[PDB]
Amino acid sequence: VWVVGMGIVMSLIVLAIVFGNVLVITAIAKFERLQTVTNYFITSLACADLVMGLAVVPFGAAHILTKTWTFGNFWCEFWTSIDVLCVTASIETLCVIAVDRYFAITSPFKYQSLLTKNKARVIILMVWIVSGLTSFLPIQMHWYRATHQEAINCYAEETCCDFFTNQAYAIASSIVSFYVPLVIMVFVYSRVFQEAKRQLQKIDKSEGRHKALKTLGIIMGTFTLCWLPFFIVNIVHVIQDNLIRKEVYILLNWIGYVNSGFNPLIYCRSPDFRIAFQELL
Numbered sequence: 001v002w003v004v005g006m007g008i009v010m011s012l013i014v015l016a017i018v019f020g021n022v023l024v025i026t027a028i029a030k031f032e033r034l035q036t037v038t039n040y041f042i043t044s045l046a047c048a049d050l051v052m053g054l055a056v057v058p059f060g061a062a063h064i065l066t067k068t069w070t071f072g073n074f075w076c077e078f079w080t081s082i083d084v085l086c087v088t089a090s091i092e093t094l095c096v097i098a099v100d101r102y103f104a105i106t107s108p109f110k111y112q113s114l115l116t117k118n119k120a121r122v123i124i125l126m127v128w129i130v131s132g133l134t135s136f137l138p139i140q141m142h143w144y145r146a147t148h149q150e151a152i153n154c155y156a157e158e159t160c161c162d163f164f165t166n167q168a169y170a171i172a173s174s175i176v177s178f179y180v181p182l183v184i185m186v187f188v189y190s191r192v193f194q195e196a197k198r199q200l201q202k203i204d205k206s207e208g209r210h211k212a213l214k215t216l217g218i219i220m221g222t223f224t225l226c227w228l229p230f231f232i233v234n235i236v237h238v239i240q241d242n243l244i245r246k247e248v249y250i251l252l253n254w255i256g257y258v259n260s261g262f263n264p265l266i267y268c269r270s271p272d273f274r275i276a277f278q279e280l281l
Protein backbone atom coordinates (compact mmCIF):
# COMPACT_ATOMS: atom_id res chain seq x y z
CA VAL A 1 0.00 0.00 0.00
CA TRP A 2 3.08 2.19 0.48
CA VAL A 3 4.95 1.13 -2.68
CA VAL A 4 3.81 4.21 -4.61
CA GLY A 5 4.28 6.51 -1.60
CA MET A 6 8.05 6.75 -1.94
CA GLY A 7 7.90 6.91 -5.74
CA ILE A 8 5.96 10.18 -5.73
CA VAL A 9 8.50 11.80 -3.39
CA MET A 10 11.41 10.51 -5.47
CA SER A 11 9.88 11.84 -8.69
CA LEU A 12 9.14 15.20 -7.07
CA ILE A 13 12.68 15.61 -5.72
CA VAL A 14 14.21 14.53 -9.05
CA LEU A 15 12.07 17.02 -10.98
CA ALA A 16 12.86 19.79 -8.49
CA ILE A 17 16.61 19.15 -8.70
CA VAL A 18 16.54 18.98 -12.51
CA PHE A 19 14.54 22.21 -12.82
CA GLY A 20 16.69 24.05 -10.28
CA ASN A 21 19.91 23.09 -12.03
CA VAL A 22 18.64 23.73 -15.57
CA LEU A 23 17.16 27.14 -14.77
CA VAL A 24 20.42 28.45 -13.30
CA ILE A 25 22.49 26.94 -16.12
CA THR A 26 20.36 28.57 -18.82
CA ALA A 27 20.07 31.86 -16.92
CA ILE A 28 23.86 32.17 -16.78
CA ALA A 29 24.13 31.38 -20.49
CA LYS A 30 21.41 33.57 -22.00
CA PHE A 31 22.17 36.95 -20.40
CA GLU A 32 25.64 38.50 -20.50
CA ARG A 33 25.09 40.62 -17.38
CA LEU A 34 25.48 37.73 -14.93
CA GLN A 35 28.63 36.48 -16.71
CA THR A 36 31.51 37.42 -14.40
CA VAL A 37 34.79 35.97 -13.10
CA THR A 38 33.14 34.32 -10.06
CA ASN A 39 30.03 32.75 -11.63
CA TYR A 40 32.03 30.00 -13.39
CA PHE A 41 32.22 28.04 -10.13
CA ILE A 42 28.44 28.35 -9.79
CA THR A 43 28.10 27.05 -13.35
CA SER A 44 30.30 24.04 -12.56
CA LEU A 45 28.36 23.32 -9.36
CA ALA A 46 25.03 23.53 -11.20
CA CYS A 47 26.30 21.25 -13.97
CA ALA A 48 27.53 18.70 -11.42
CA ASP A 49 24.19 18.81 -9.60
CA LEU A 50 22.30 18.33 -12.88
CA VAL A 51 24.50 15.37 -13.85
CA MET A 52 24.07 13.78 -10.42
CA GLY A 53 20.30 14.23 -10.48
CA LEU A 54 20.01 12.87 -14.02
CA ALA A 55 22.29 9.85 -13.58
CA VAL A 56 22.22 8.75 -9.92
CA VAL A 57 18.78 9.55 -8.49
CA PRO A 58 16.50 7.59 -10.91
CA PHE A 59 18.53 4.38 -11.06
CA GLY A 60 19.07 4.37 -7.31
CA ALA A 61 15.42 5.08 -6.52
CA ALA A 62 14.38 2.24 -8.84
CA HIS A 63 16.88 -0.05 -7.11
CA ILE A 64 15.22 0.38 -3.70
CA LEU A 65 11.71 0.44 -5.18
CA THR A 66 11.85 -2.87 -7.07
CA LYS A 67 14.40 -4.26 -4.55
CA THR A 68 16.31 -5.92 -7.43
CA TRP A 69 19.29 -4.70 -9.47
CA THR A 70 17.91 -6.04 -12.74
CA PHE A 71 20.56 -4.11 -14.68
CA GLY A 72 23.86 -5.66 -15.70
CA ASN A 73 27.03 -6.01 -13.67
CA PHE A 74 29.02 -3.43 -15.67
CA TRP A 75 26.58 -0.60 -14.94
CA CYS A 76 26.83 -0.95 -11.14
CA GLU A 77 30.44 0.21 -10.80
CA PHE A 78 29.77 2.97 -13.33
CA TRP A 79 26.82 4.23 -11.25
CA THR A 80 28.81 4.08 -8.01
CA SER A 81 31.73 5.96 -9.57
CA ILE A 82 29.36 8.61 -10.95
CA ASP A 83 27.85 9.15 -7.50
CA VAL A 84 31.26 9.39 -5.81
CA LEU A 85 32.60 11.78 -8.47
CA CYS A 86 29.54 14.03 -8.23
CA VAL A 87 29.71 14.23 -4.43
CA THR A 88 33.45 14.93 -4.41
CA ALA A 89 33.17 17.57 -7.15
CA SER A 90 30.33 19.34 -5.33
CA ILE A 91 32.29 19.42 -2.06
CA GLU A 92 35.45 20.66 -3.76
CA THR A 93 33.68 23.40 -5.74
CA LEU A 94 31.93 24.58 -2.56
CA CYS A 95 35.34 24.82 -0.88
CA VAL A 96 36.71 26.77 -3.86
CA ILE A 97 33.79 29.20 -3.91
CA ALA A 98 34.32 29.82 -0.18
CA VAL A 99 38.07 30.41 -0.63
CA ASP A 100 37.30 32.87 -3.44
CA ARG A 101 35.10 34.96 -1.14
CA TYR A 102 37.77 34.79 1.56
CA PHE A 103 40.30 36.25 -0.88
CA ALA A 104 37.77 38.85 -2.03
CA ILE A 105 36.96 40.13 1.46
CA THR A 106 40.06 39.52 3.59
CA SER A 107 42.68 41.15 1.31
CA PRO A 108 41.31 43.72 -1.14
CA PHE A 109 43.37 45.97 -3.46
CA LYS A 110 44.86 42.91 -5.22
CA TYR A 111 41.86 40.62 -5.82
CA GLN A 112 41.09 42.29 -9.16
CA SER A 113 44.60 41.68 -10.51
CA LEU A 114 45.20 38.31 -8.82
CA LEU A 115 42.15 36.56 -10.30
CA THR A 116 41.28 36.46 -14.00
CA LYS A 117 39.28 34.43 -16.50
CA ASN A 118 42.22 32.10 -17.21
CA LYS A 119 42.87 31.25 -13.55
CA ALA A 120 39.29 30.16 -12.83
CA ARG A 121 39.20 27.57 -15.63
CA VAL A 122 42.56 26.14 -14.53
CA ILE A 123 41.39 25.95 -10.91
CA ILE A 124 38.10 24.23 -11.76
CA LEU A 125 39.81 21.82 -14.17
CA MET A 126 42.34 20.87 -11.48
CA VAL A 127 39.50 20.46 -8.97
CA TRP A 128 37.59 18.12 -11.29
CA ILE A 129 40.78 16.20 -12.13
CA VAL A 130 41.52 15.68 -8.43
CA SER A 131 37.92 14.57 -7.88
CA GLY A 132 38.13 12.10 -10.77
CA LEU A 133 41.48 10.67 -9.66
CA THR A 134 39.72 9.20 -6.61
CA SER A 135 36.48 8.45 -8.50
CA PHE A 136 37.09 6.35 -11.62
CA LEU A 137 40.53 4.85 -10.98
CA PRO A 138 39.79 2.98 -7.70
CA ILE A 139 36.30 1.88 -8.82
CA GLN A 140 36.80 0.69 -12.40
CA MET A 141 39.99 -1.08 -11.40
CA HIS A 142 39.04 -3.97 -9.12
CA TRP A 143 40.35 -2.62 -5.81
CA TYR A 144 38.83 -1.94 -2.36
CA ARG A 145 37.07 -5.33 -2.41
CA ALA A 146 36.07 -6.85 0.93
CA THR A 147 38.27 -9.77 1.94
CA HIS A 148 35.62 -11.29 4.20
CA GLN A 149 33.56 -14.00 2.54
CA GLU A 150 30.29 -12.08 2.84
CA ALA A 151 29.35 -10.04 -0.28
CA ILE A 152 31.73 -12.15 -2.41
CA ASN A 153 28.57 -13.78 -3.75
CA CYS A 154 27.14 -10.30 -4.35
CA TYR A 155 30.26 -9.50 -6.37
CA ALA A 156 29.77 -12.76 -8.29
CA GLU A 157 25.98 -12.52 -8.58
CA GLU A 158 24.85 -10.15 -11.32
CA THR A 159 21.35 -9.77 -9.87
CA CYS A 160 22.52 -8.51 -6.46
CA CYS A 161 24.28 -5.15 -6.17
CA ASP A 162 25.44 -3.68 -2.86
CA PHE A 163 28.15 -1.39 -1.47
CA PHE A 164 30.98 -3.16 0.36
CA THR A 165 34.37 -1.48 0.83
CA ASN A 166 37.64 -1.99 2.66
CA GLN A 167 38.55 0.11 5.69
CA ALA A 168 41.54 1.87 4.12
CA TYR A 169 39.76 3.07 0.98
CA ALA A 170 36.71 4.21 2.95
CA ILE A 171 38.71 6.23 5.48
CA ALA A 172 40.98 7.71 2.81
CA SER A 173 38.03 8.77 0.65
CA SER A 174 36.21 10.28 3.64
CA ILE A 175 39.32 12.23 4.68
CA VAL A 176 40.12 13.44 1.16
CA SER A 177 36.51 14.37 0.38
CA PHE A 178 34.85 15.75 3.53
CA TYR A 179 36.94 16.91 6.48
CA VAL A 180 39.57 19.15 4.84
CA PRO A 181 36.97 21.31 3.00
CA LEU A 182 34.99 21.57 6.24
CA VAL A 183 38.03 22.81 8.17
CA ILE A 184 38.81 25.25 5.35
CA MET A 185 35.25 26.61 5.48
CA VAL A 186 35.36 26.95 9.27
CA PHE A 187 38.62 28.93 9.26
CA VAL A 188 37.61 31.07 6.26
CA TYR A 189 34.21 32.01 7.63
CA SER A 190 35.55 32.67 11.13
CA ARG A 191 37.99 35.17 9.62
CA VAL A 192 35.25 36.70 7.46
CA PHE A 193 32.90 37.07 10.44
CA GLN A 194 35.69 38.68 12.48
CA GLU A 195 36.34 41.20 9.70
CA ALA A 196 32.62 41.97 9.34
CA LYS A 197 32.27 42.49 13.10
CA ARG A 198 35.28 44.83 13.09
CA GLN A 199 33.78 46.86 10.24
CA LEU A 200 30.40 47.06 11.98
CA GLN A 201 32.04 48.21 15.21
CA LYS A 202 34.03 50.85 13.32
CA ILE A 203 30.88 52.17 11.64
CA ASP A 204 28.99 52.22 14.95
CA LYS A 205 31.81 54.14 16.65
CA SER A 206 32.08 56.57 13.73
CA GLU A 207 28.37 57.40 13.35
CA GLY A 208 26.44 57.55 16.62
CA ARG A 209 22.96 58.96 15.95
CA HIS A 210 22.91 40.44 12.45
CA LYS A 211 22.44 40.04 8.70
CA ALA A 212 25.96 38.65 8.22
CA LEU A 213 25.47 36.26 11.14
CA LYS A 214 22.20 34.99 9.67
CA THR A 215 23.52 34.64 6.11
CA LEU A 216 26.53 32.69 7.38
CA GLY A 217 24.56 30.53 9.81
CA ILE A 218 22.02 29.47 7.20
CA ILE A 219 24.75 28.17 4.88
CA MET A 220 26.70 26.50 7.68
CA GLY A 221 23.62 24.81 9.13
CA THR A 222 22.43 23.62 5.73
CA PHE A 223 25.82 22.15 4.78
CA THR A 224 26.47 20.54 8.17
CA LEU A 225 22.97 19.06 8.52
CA CYS A 226 22.97 17.71 4.96
CA TRP A 227 26.43 16.15 4.82
CA LEU A 228 27.82 15.59 8.34
CA PRO A 229 26.02 12.39 9.54
CA PHE A 230 26.78 10.30 6.44
CA PHE A 231 30.55 10.56 6.82
CA ILE A 232 30.18 10.36 10.61
CA VAL A 233 28.76 6.85 10.19
CA ASN A 234 30.93 6.02 7.16
CA ILE A 235 34.09 6.49 9.23
CA VAL A 236 32.81 4.26 12.01
CA HIS A 237 31.01 1.29 10.44
CA VAL A 238 34.13 -0.04 8.70
CA ILE A 239 36.24 0.40 11.84
CA GLN A 240 34.01 -1.92 13.89
CA ASP A 241 31.49 -4.29 12.34
CA ASN A 242 27.88 -4.84 13.49
CA LEU A 243 27.73 -1.30 14.92
CA ILE A 244 25.07 -0.05 12.48
CA ARG A 245 22.35 -1.40 10.19
CA LYS A 246 21.94 -1.08 6.43
CA GLU A 247 18.58 0.73 6.52
CA VAL A 248 19.95 3.65 8.56
CA TYR A 249 23.00 3.81 6.29
CA ILE A 250 20.92 4.00 3.10
CA LEU A 251 18.53 6.51 4.68
CA LEU A 252 21.41 8.80 5.63
CA ASN A 253 22.90 8.36 2.15
CA TRP A 254 19.59 9.37 0.57
CA ILE A 255 19.11 12.36 2.89
CA GLY A 256 22.64 13.39 1.93
CA TYR A 257 21.45 13.73 -1.67
CA VAL A 258 18.93 16.48 -0.83
CA ASN A 259 21.74 19.04 -0.58
CA SER A 260 22.17 19.20 -4.36
CA GLY A 261 18.54 20.32 -4.67
CA PHE A 262 19.08 23.27 -2.33
CA ASN A 263 22.24 24.91 -3.72
CA PRO A 264 20.55 26.85 -6.58
CA LEU A 265 17.97 28.23 -4.14
CA ILE A 266 20.56 29.33 -1.55
CA TYR A 267 23.48 30.56 -3.74
CA CYS A 268 21.42 32.98 -5.88
CA ARG A 269 19.70 36.07 -4.46
CA SER A 270 21.28 39.04 -6.27
CA PRO A 271 18.92 41.49 -8.02
CA ASP A 272 20.50 40.62 -11.38
CA PHE A 273 19.57 36.97 -10.88
CA ARG A 274 16.02 37.97 -9.90
CA ILE A 275 15.69 40.12 -13.03
CA ALA A 276 17.02 37.28 -15.19
CA PHE A 277 14.53 34.84 -13.66
CA GLN A 278 11.69 37.34 -14.17
CA GLU A 279 12.72 37.72 -17.82
CA LEU A 280 11.71 34.08 -18.42
CA LEU A 281 8.28 33.99 -16.77
Ligand SMILES: CN[C@@H]1CCc2c(ccc(O)c2O)[C@H]1O
Binding pocket: 080, 083, 084, 087, 088, 163, 170, 173, 174, 177, 234, 253
Ligand atom coordinates in the same frame (compact mmCIF):
# COMPACT_ATOMS: atom_id res chain seq x y z
C1 LIG B 1 26.60 4.66 -2.58
N1 LIG B 1 26.82 6.10 -2.34
C2 LIG B 1 28.22 6.46 -1.98
C3 LIG B 1 28.69 5.73 -0.70
C4 LIG B 1 30.05 6.23 -0.11
C5 LIG B 1 30.67 7.52 -0.69
C6 LIG B 1 29.89 8.38 -1.49
C7 LIG B 1 30.52 9.55 -1.99
C8 LIG B 1 31.83 9.88 -1.71
C9 LIG B 1 32.64 9.06 -0.91
O1 LIG B 1 33.92 9.33 -0.62
C10 LIG B 1 32.04 7.84 -0.39
O2 LIG B 1 32.77 7.04 0.37
C11 LIG B 1 28.42 8.02 -1.81
O3 LIG B 1 28.02 8.62 -3.00
